[PDB]
Structure 1
Amino acid sequence: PIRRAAVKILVHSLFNMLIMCTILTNCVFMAQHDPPPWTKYVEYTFTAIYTFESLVKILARGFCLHAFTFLRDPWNWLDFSVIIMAYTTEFVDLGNVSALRTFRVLRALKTISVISGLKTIVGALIQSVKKLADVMVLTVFCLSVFALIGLQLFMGNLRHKCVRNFTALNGTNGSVEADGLVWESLDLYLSDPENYLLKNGTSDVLLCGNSSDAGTCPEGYRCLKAGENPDHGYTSFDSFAWAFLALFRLMTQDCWERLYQQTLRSAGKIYMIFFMLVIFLGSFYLVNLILAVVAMAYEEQNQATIAETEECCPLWMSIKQGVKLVVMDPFTDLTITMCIVLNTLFMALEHYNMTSEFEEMLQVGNLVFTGIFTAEMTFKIIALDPYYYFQQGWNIFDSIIVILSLMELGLSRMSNLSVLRSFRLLRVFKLAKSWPTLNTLIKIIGNSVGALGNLTLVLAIIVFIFAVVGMQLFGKNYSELRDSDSGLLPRWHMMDFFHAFLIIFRILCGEWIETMWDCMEVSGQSLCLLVFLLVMVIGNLVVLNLFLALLLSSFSAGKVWWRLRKTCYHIVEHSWFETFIIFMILLSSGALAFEDIYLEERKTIKVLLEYADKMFTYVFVLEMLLKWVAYGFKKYFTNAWCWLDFLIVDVSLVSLVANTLGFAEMGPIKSLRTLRALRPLRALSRFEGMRVVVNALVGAIPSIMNVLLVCLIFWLIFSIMGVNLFAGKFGRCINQTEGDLPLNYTIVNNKSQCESLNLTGELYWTKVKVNFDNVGAGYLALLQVATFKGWMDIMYAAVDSRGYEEQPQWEYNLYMYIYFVIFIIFGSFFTLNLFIGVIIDNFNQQKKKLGGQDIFMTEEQKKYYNAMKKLGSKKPQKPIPRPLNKYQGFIFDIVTKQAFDVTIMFLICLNMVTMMVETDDQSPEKINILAKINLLFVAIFTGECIVKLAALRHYYFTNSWNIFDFVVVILSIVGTVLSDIIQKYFFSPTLFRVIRLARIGRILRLIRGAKGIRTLLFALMMSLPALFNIGLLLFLVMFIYSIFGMANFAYVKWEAGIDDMFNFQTFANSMLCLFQITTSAGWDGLLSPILNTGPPYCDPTLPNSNGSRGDCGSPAVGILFFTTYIIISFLIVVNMYIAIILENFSVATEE
């Protein structure tokens, strides 16, 4: 029959090509918002094609009872699904959802089985997850524990608001209040929102706690607890769901700076210990436990798979001879490499307001420089025939660019304004043959595009599917978020396809929240959370699998002088002298923390400092001189540890020699004294842990300068592109009084119109703080987009680039989001891959040199590791239980049963769920039932210990898990007892909660027997000393940068991220600000006030106490402080990741 012909038609590749074309046509047609009704054919033709494909399959391998053949393969289930859904829907619709268009999106996941590579990858991305199992359960366990702790500590503590004062009236029957307007009912008032105060600058409402360490309210405002939680109600810690989402955002580090700042501004600055604990414990150890598990697997499958894979005639010549003769000369190569360098430099000299001299030469520069290349190609064309000239993989390269460039310059009236110039740019890549690191950077782009080019295809398919699903589900709704005043919807919407692609990308780049929040207000919470969080788990898994993979691939492929010297050697050998020095170093360092804006007026201390200042230097000088004698000039000048102390004491001596003698406080001499900030640095030598860490970091310096260099050139391409695109297009008019937002483009469109309507001086043409005007000014902005912090203001201004020297417009240049999309993959994803690989390699080799020994670890810490590891590498053997007394001879058998263990372990889960039910604003009846139950529970538990103690005299204690337990119950028995004792105690709300929190300890009791957590948590215990050595280095570094910040960044305007409680006006406020920045969080808000010197935006001549005048921060030093810190912090936190990853690969791999 035709079945045998159906099999023939089944095996052809034309069938697969037709199926792929139909699927791609469907994908293109599905991305259209208001589909047109011409679709009588298409929805129907497709349905015909997809029915025909299933017909071909069932005719060839269908028949009857096909458990063995058709439909057995899991993928064909999708196909049948598609056909049934299709017909049912196309038939009629009566009282249904009718938004079942989203079901068609599933038709496009059929590409997976056809393109052959896709099916296997989506097969193995799925098997990866199966290995991240424990990690996902510990994630849930730790998230629940921290959610309970946050619930108890900040129960309803996010609602506090500064509200206008009220009085009670006493002329009306119920609670009545007044403030120029009588308002019936307290709650009618504590609710209305014209009675709350707007935080300066932001549009929020102030959050104000009553504790001393917390926000204080303005004069006419009392600070209470009434109203609706910030950010529309999704941030409060009132309920366990809201204390789980708001703490999972802390795990993923999404806008955690906003919650940190609001939480503390209501509960107090001491409560920053909780945040630190969440950020270290979870964001770091957890995220990394997952990356290591995802990695443990990729290697395993590739290792098994690779292993299993193993298992003219007169004269053309005399001068043709000549043409080659010039071409191959070694010096012919030098002229060339160098001419490349000059071009990049010549190019990177465009700027915003070039004087015409800089401009004409810039043109007279390209001609010469492109020309040199024309001679290189023609000579190289005359050298050999075109058969041999278009090969080897680097002649073609050159050939195209040379060709493209010549092309455009020719019209002279040529239209492309910029790329046209930057076509030349790619030449920079040519330095590759010479540069191993640029060669490695190119090989990675190539690998991802071509070889493991199936993973990126899978990622693109997933992103497309998620974008179309989100658009279809949520597009209709976002029309309300539209301001009907301006018909302006959000900048992030999902109404159209592109706008959607971007929300899906943002979610990939880390920024998922501000969007659930803006979609849960138009769409209803249940779905928004379901979809916008679905993109996350899958996506971050795919983006990570592609990344880990690219990396792995590169890896796979008088005679008394001689005794006077010894008598001063012995004082060095005497412990007491240098210990004095060590203490003197700490004290010396500390005394820096007291110089705040208020020391000027703390007289009794100001002076104390100075006596000490002097003595401090002397104790040291006596020490430098003592050393020079004891070890001589050789050892002191050759160790490079004494060199740092030498420079520090040099500048310290210059300070007092110029000041006291010279009576000179003029010019930069005081600026030299802002460098006493480094007195902390004396310490790095002294403490061994900080020392092994700094040695490990120094050993990696040569590679880091190369990796930092390639980025610098690569971002040079992006920076010159950005300068060429957005030069002079970031300036916007502002009416000042009315506000900080550009005026409309219809009212004022050109700068010539901006400065022609200033009859009343309110209009200021102010550029964006971070913009594209210089090549160097470009690189900051790129640091903001590449770190993802502050990038939104740059992206919102580039898209509005209406043109040169003219007002911005709302979305004139929408597609420039593409530039930003391109930089981020190459600039953030690929450059980072190189960074991580090289760091790992240097590290890998160092470990080998000192074989069997991690870096980041002292000698004494070694021996701990050695014993600690031994304890849990071997299980205990020989329990030896004894009946003992007949009195307990029938109790000890019951206490040891497995049934007893599981019922206890499930009573702990019952306690867990009865804990999860708390909430703010609970009725007396609820509060009441719940507390009685808490008493019941303590009781069962006290008892359990008791029977466990029946005759288990010695072994209750030696279990080391049982011993942990007594403590828990005692804390608990006390806890209940301590309950009514608080009455004679001050500040009653916060003493209580903390003792309540001991209840969580039971929660921690579940893991005696849950092995998965036990190995995984044990690991941290083995890694704890390494993290510590690095931590001290982070701290010493924070102090040094904190002192530097208070030196210059005090008295800066308070706007953006410098606000009253987080400012650089003292030590505590300075160190709080650094804590956010150490995670690169919110670092543009900190810096924007610094980079502000201006008649608008700041004010010259404010009168200031200590710093004496000026209210405007300095950009030149501020840009250096933050930019240097972001990098110093990056390299130090990255160091930690390796410490865990290798060590988690030391506990798991070992077993």
Structure 2
Amino acid sequence: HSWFSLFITVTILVNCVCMTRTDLPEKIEYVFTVIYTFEALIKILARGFDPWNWLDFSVITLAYVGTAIDLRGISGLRTFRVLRALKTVSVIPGLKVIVGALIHSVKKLADVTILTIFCLSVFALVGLQLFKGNLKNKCVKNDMAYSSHRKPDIYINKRGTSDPLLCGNGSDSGHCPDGYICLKTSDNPDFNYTSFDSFAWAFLSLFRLMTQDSWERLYQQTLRTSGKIYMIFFVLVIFLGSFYLVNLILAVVTMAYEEQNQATWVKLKTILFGLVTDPFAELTITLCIVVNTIFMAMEHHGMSPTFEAMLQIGNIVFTIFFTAEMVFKIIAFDPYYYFQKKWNIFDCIIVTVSLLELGVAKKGSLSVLRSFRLLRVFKLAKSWPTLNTLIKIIGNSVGALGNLTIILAIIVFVFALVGKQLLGENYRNNRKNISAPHEDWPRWHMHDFFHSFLIVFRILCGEWIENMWACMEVGQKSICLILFLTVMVLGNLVVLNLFIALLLNSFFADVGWQVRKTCYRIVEHSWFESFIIFMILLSSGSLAFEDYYLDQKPTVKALLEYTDRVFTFIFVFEMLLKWVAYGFKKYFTNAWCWLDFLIVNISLISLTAKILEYSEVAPIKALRTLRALRPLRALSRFEGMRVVVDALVGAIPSIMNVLLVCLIFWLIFSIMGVNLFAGKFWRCINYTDGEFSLVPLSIVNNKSDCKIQNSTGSFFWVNVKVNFDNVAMGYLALLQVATFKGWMDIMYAAVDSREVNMQPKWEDNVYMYLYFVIFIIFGGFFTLNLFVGVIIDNFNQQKKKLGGQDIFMTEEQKKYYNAMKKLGSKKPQKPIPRPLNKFQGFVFDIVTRQAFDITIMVLICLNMITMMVETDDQSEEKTKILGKINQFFVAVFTGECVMKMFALRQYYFTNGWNVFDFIVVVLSIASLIFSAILKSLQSYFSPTLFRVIRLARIGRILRLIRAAKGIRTLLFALMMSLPALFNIGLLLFLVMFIYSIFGMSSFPHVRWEAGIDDMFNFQTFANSMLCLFQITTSAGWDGLLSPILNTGPPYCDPNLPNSNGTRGDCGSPAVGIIFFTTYIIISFLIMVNMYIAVILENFNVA
């Protein structure tokens, strides 16, 4: 009956929340059981008058019997309860269609994994070959004076961290300080879980790199242990590893999703005067909203009392005005008509909350309620189409797409509860191992439901491997692997499905004339143009020599002085020649000649100051910094870069408007964050030597007390570098949370936040995490959907304007594209003629059959399996046996190739696959003899090159893609899309170079802190390039911004004994803030364009 079902639905709802709650008093569960056994009895009576329900009854009876002996315990009983409690949730009419839709998504992704795991295995084998046992390298002290190791190996900790320092014996690897030599130890960096020593560890590391979870940490470790050059590895892999796989995941799901939805008296006078309401009143309302917004966006830590009083008076006046509009409108319409509109109820509730706050006015009382007035900006949407669109996206997410949100929330809840129950006792009895040095609890644990939900949400943000390391050290490793991997895969699947759906559904539902002629002819000629291109390239390249060490090279500096003056003379003459050749009107109406003119003007001003006695003046020294804009002249010449920039310029107008709405939305969040956290991020630290430790609340609980106890001089009252004290800084804080780098530091301070001038306490405001959660869900998450949708429809309209012509490719790249497209479609090639000779004919008969081909593939698979068993520090005998096996394999493949050549004389060389195995065979033979000759008869070179010589066995592995249809097709799609990626990568390389010049001139001095160390700094072109590549993907950009945000002790030496240029260990916060933010935004736009190009390419191929 209906009443029976409703009883069942409510009791299970009680359990959802009942398990969410710990410390059951063993009285709630009993009251629940009495009820469930009565329901089971009546169900049995009905049944006499499904097997799963029968099994549930058996489980409950088993628990009833088990209360006497070994009560509770094990782990599984609670997890068995939740499945039964979850069936009712699953029964919702709409959820079943959605999960059926999702199964198709995993069936479509099938082909992608076949290729994803193949690529991960191949690059994991490469990484195993190159870096096995290199992450075990550590800086070990020497001895003064022999049995085994002299005492325990005393390592050193890198500045600012407790981790042992990783070094190398190479020139570009990394070196130990004085009194320290590199030794390969037995312990690996993180928890002995980060390595390249075996195929399992290498596969885990490559999977971490594919998702880019803290990948910059592994980047630095391997480049510090092996050498800077191996960054190229990490470059080639990172792009294909993350970018390419996402290209497929998205396309392969997006089409699939589209597929399915392609299948489907005085009162009368008051009423009159209220109806008298005219458009001149609406403008007043909007004006009041804007002025209130700007007044509320004017709060900061350092407000004067008069400043605060004026803000308070203004806020009251506005609240009175809005209450006035309420009382006018209610007695203008009727309240039944009034309370029928959707916006009227919203206005009513906001102003009611505002009046309630005006009533109970305590300093800090429910500050969240003081920011609901900000919601009134949403009323500024009936005239702004974009804000309305954002609201439509959210409403579509809630109402029409509600089932996806429900399944995502249920997945998060179920997995958090399951992990809490399985792993919970472990995080309390083992908490010492995974906690920070001076803390007594891990910051991310699973003892209680809130923290389990936080860990699940953080995994949904892409940060899972560190928490996995923490849990594998506290509990069972297999449980961690299963839990974290399933959570990550399943949650990312659901989130991408929700995101793509929302975009697709909401968004898409007389002598002078002769001289002029001669000059024009001279300019038009191609040699002149090539000369100018060559000069631009040389001018750009010379800028890459002006690093921190130029002052030590006396000749180089002088050479550049001449190089820069002669180049300036060249371009001024070139401008003069063009001016005479084209004419003034044509020149000054070109939009490229203006760029050349401005750059030449800057260079000429710098040179004129250099010749004069104004080289040291403040503004000229700032124009000298704009010598990094010279490479843009190269962008002018090259046509691919011109095409890409033209697209960027066409897109810009829409990104302007979308950007404005994002700023308005963030401004709301920043005002809320200032209301909550402004001035509460200050805390005392003990700074002794490059390391700061938070002063404990026992000895010092108050600001004043640090001054009282500062006998040593080591105690400093400091504020977090990025904070909500100021609204502008708040946007930077929000940006870090949206990027997901540096988001944690801001959050920990907010959770520890207490009253102003009060020492922060461990997790005293633990429910402030929710605020950040809401931001991530509503701000970055909603805005990014709008941003992507706007970019997509802009792309569609622009390509339709072209006539559908593909953008990002030059005209000759179009011809290459057409030829490459025609290549892939030709089926017939004709049968190859049979050999006339009996012996050649017999070899032909042997080689032509499919059995030979299958035998060759299974042999290569065996070779692959033989290659997966290589491990660091394995044995001598194992190495010899593997070498003999490799010799047998190479002999077999050599013989096979010879047989093929005999059977197929010229037809062999005709096919490209045949050319490819021939090349791999020759490479393997050359590798095998080469390695032997240096060892046998030549001076012993570095072993690390041998590790590179044996990289010729991977070609035999890549021979397999001959057989697989999906992988071959995907590879063909990538090949087709390469030409446009070339131009976009050229633009990205130019941007990186310019930024490197800007960083190498503006940031080399900065104290080594956080990301900035002896290898990743801005003192050299290569060092800046490494930093730029790392932040290209936004990884670890807060780590480089942090040292630049330092403006005094204990992080700076006010004047310093040795620094003429900046006179400090100080970095420029405005420049750094501007420099880092601009690059990430530009890189994000470029990478979005690359996504668009390759996904369109995949769609055309499919």
TM-score normalised by length of structure 1: 0.92
Cα distance in 1 for partners of 2:1043, 2:42 equals 63
What does residue 269 of structure 1 align with? 228
Any conservation in 2 of the 1:800–1:808 contact (CA below 8 Å)?
yes
Match among 590, 604, 616 for residue 639 of structure 1: 590
Any conservation in 2 of the 1:16–1:114 contact (CA below 8 Å)?
no
Match among 347, 358, 365 for residue 314 of structure 2: 365
Corresponding pairs, count? 1093
SS of 1:162's equivalent? strand
1:23 is aligned to 2:15 = no
Any conservation in 2 of the 1:481–1:489 contact (CA below 8 Å)?
no
Deviation at 1:826, TM superposition (A): 0.6
1:533 is aligned to 2:481 = no
Taking the TM superposition and a 5 Å limit, the aligned residue runs for 1:160-239 are: 160-166=137-143, 176=146, 184-186=147-149, 189=151, 192-193=152-153, 195-239=154-198
Change (3 A) 1:423 1:32: closer
1:605 is aligned to 2:556 = yes
SS of 1:157's equivalent? coil
What does residue 130 of structure 1 align with? 107
Question: How big is the alpha-carbon RMSD for the aligned residues of Structure 1 and Structure 2?
Answer: 2.1
1:435 is aligned to 2:435 = no
Code of the residue aligned with 1:85 in structure 2: it is V
Code of the residue aligned with 2:397 in structure 1: it is S
Deviation at 1:870, TM superposition (A): 1.3
Deviation at 1:483, TM superposition (A): 3.2
Change (3 A) 1:259 1:107: same
What does residue 25 of structure 2 align with? 36
Deviation at 1:290, TM superposition (A): 1.0
Cα distance in 1 for partners of 2:187, 2:713 equals 40
Change (3 A) 1:16 1:690: farther
Any conservation in 2 of the 1:162–1:208 contact (CA below 8 Å)?
yes
What does residue 68 of structure 1 align with? none
1:383 is aligned to 2:332 = yes
1:473 is aligned to 2:473 = no
Structure 1 stretch 923-932 or stretch 271-280: which is displaced more?
A: 923-932
Any conservation in 2 of the 1:569–1:631 contact (CA below 8 Å)?
yes
Q: Deviations over 1:653-692 (max 9, x none)?
A: 2112233134442222111101101111111110011111
Change (3 A) 1:110 1:417: closer
1:252 is aligned to 2:211 = yes
Match among 76, 98, 121 for residue 100 of structure 1: 76
Deviation at 1:1087, TM superposition (A): 0.6
Deviation at 1:593, TM superposition (A): 0.7
Cα distance in 2 for partners of 1:1049, 1:530 equals 44
Match among 649, 652, 658 for residue 701 of structure 1: 652
Any conservation in 2 of the 1:161–1:226 contact (CA below 8 Å)?
yes
Change (3 A) 1:39 1:336: closer
Code of the residue aligned with 1:389 in structure 2: it is Y
Cα distance in 2 for partners of 1:97, 1:889 equals 74
1:1096 is aligned to 2:1043 = no
1:426 is aligned to 2:400 = no
SS of 1:133's equivalent? helix
What does residue 1040 of structure 2 align with? 1086
Code of the residue aligned with 1:1115 in structure 2: it is P
SS of 1:116's equivalent? coil
Cα distance in 1 for partners of 2:309, 2:960 equals 76
Change (3 A) 1:40 1:671: closer
Change (3 A) 1:1065 1:533: same
Change (3 A) 1:893 1:109: farther
Deviation at 1:280, TM superposition (A): 1.0
Taking the TM superposition and a 5 Å limit, the aligned residue runs for 1:272-283 are: 272-283=231-242
Match among 275, 279, 288 for residue 339 of structure 1: 288
Deviation at 1:52, TM superposition (A): 6.0
Q: Deviations over 1:617-666 (max 9, x none)?
A: 11111122222222222111111111111211121121122331344422
What does residue 1019 of structure 1 align with? 973
Deviation at 1:319, TM superposition (A): 5.7
What does residue 786 of structure 2 align with? 834
Q: Deviations over 1:892-948 (max 9, x none)?
A: 222222222212111111110100001111121211211111111111111221222
Deviation at 1:480, TM superposition (A): 4.1
Code of the residue aligned with 1:111 in structure 2: it is T
Match among 55, 61, 79 for residue 87 of structure 1: 61
Deviation at 1:138, TM superposition (A): 0.3
Match among 558, 567, 578 for residue 616 of structure 1: 567
Code of the residue aligned with 1:639 in structure 2: it is N
Code of the residue aligned with 1:925 in structure 2: it is E
What does residue 715 of structure 2 align with? 763
Cα distance in 1 for partners of 2:211, 2:562 equals 49
Deviation at 1:512, TM superposition (A): 0.2
What does residue 672 of structure 1 align with? 623
Any conservation in 1 of the 2:847–2:903 contact (CA below 8 Å)?
no
1:1109 is aligned to 2:1063 = yes
Change (3 A) 1:784 1:413: closer
Code of the residue aligned with 2:998 in structure 1: it is F
Q: Deviations over 1:836-858 (max 9, x none)?
A: 10011111111111123111111
SS of 1:103's equivalent? helix
Change (3 A) 1:284 1:54: farther
Code of the residue aligned with 2:30 in structure 1: it is Y
Any conservation in 2 of the 1:1077–1:1083 contact (CA below 8 Å)?
yes
Match among 600, 619, 629 for residue 580 of structure 2: 629
What does residue 1066 of structure 1 align with? 1020
Deviation at 1:985, TM superposition (A): 4.4
Deviation at 1:601, TM superposition (A): 1.3
Q: Which runs of 5+ in 2 are unaligned?
A: none
What does residue 851 of structure 1 align with? 803
Q: Deviations over 1:552-587 (max 9, x none)?
A: 112332x22222221111111112222211111111
Deviation at 1:241, TM superposition (A): 0.1
Any conservation in 2 of the 1:600–1:1106 contact (CA below 8 Å)?
no
Any conservation in 1 of the 2:353–2:369 contact (CA below 8 Å)?
no
Any conservation in 1 of the 2:628–2:994 contact (CA below 8 Å)?
yes
SS of 1:243's equivalent? helix
SS of 1:222's equivalent? strand
Cα distance in 1 for partners of 2:301, 2:865 equals 63
Cα distance in 2 for partners of 1:424, 1:1034 equals 43
Any conservation in 1 of the 2:275–2:332 contact (CA below 8 Å)?
yes
SS of 1:809's equivalent? coil
Cα distance in 1 for partners of 2:559, 2:612 equals 20
SS of 2:491's equivalent? helix
SS of 1:132's equivalent? helix
Deviation at 1:337, TM superposition (A): 1.5
Structure 1 stretch 1022-1031 or stretch 44-53: which is displaced more?
A: 44-53
Deviation at 1:221, TM superposition (A): 1.1
Deviation at 1:958, TM superposition (A): 1.9
SS of 1:1051's equivalent? coil
Change (3 A) 1:266 1:367: same
Any conservation in 2 of the 1:47–1:83 contact (CA below 8 Å)?
no
Code of the residue aligned with 1:201 in structure 2: it is G
Change (3 A) 1:985 1:833: farther
What does residue 299 of structure 1 align with? 258
TM-score normalised by length of structure 2: 0.96
Cα distance in 2 for partners of 1:908, 1:83 equals 54
Cα distance in 2 for partners of 1:1017, 1:48 equals 60
Deviation at 1:949, TM superposition (A): 2.5
What does residue 670 of structure 2 align with? 719
Cα distance in 1 for partners of 2:552, 2:89 equals 72
Code of the residue aligned with 2:1015 in structure 1: it is M
Change (3 A) 1:648 1:45: farther
Cα distance in 2 for partners of 1:900, 1:1025 equals 37
Cα distance in 2 for partners of 1:986, 1:853 equals 58
1:806 is aligned to 2:769 = no
Deviation at 1:31, TM superposition (A): 2.1
1:898 is aligned to 2:850 = yes
Any conservation in 1 of the 2:752–2:760 contact (CA below 8 Å)?
yes
What does residue 74 of structure 1 align with? none
Cα distance in 2 for partners of 1:856, 1:78 equals 58
Cα distance in 2 for partners of 1:955, 1:83 equals 71
Code of the residue aligned with 1:230 in structure 2: it is P
What does residue 952 of structure 2 align with? 998
Code of the residue aligned with 1:438 in structure 2: it is L
Q: Deviations over 1:1044-1073 (max 9, x none)?
A: 001111111001111001111111101101
SS of 2:770's equivalent? helix
SS of 1:732's equivalent? strand
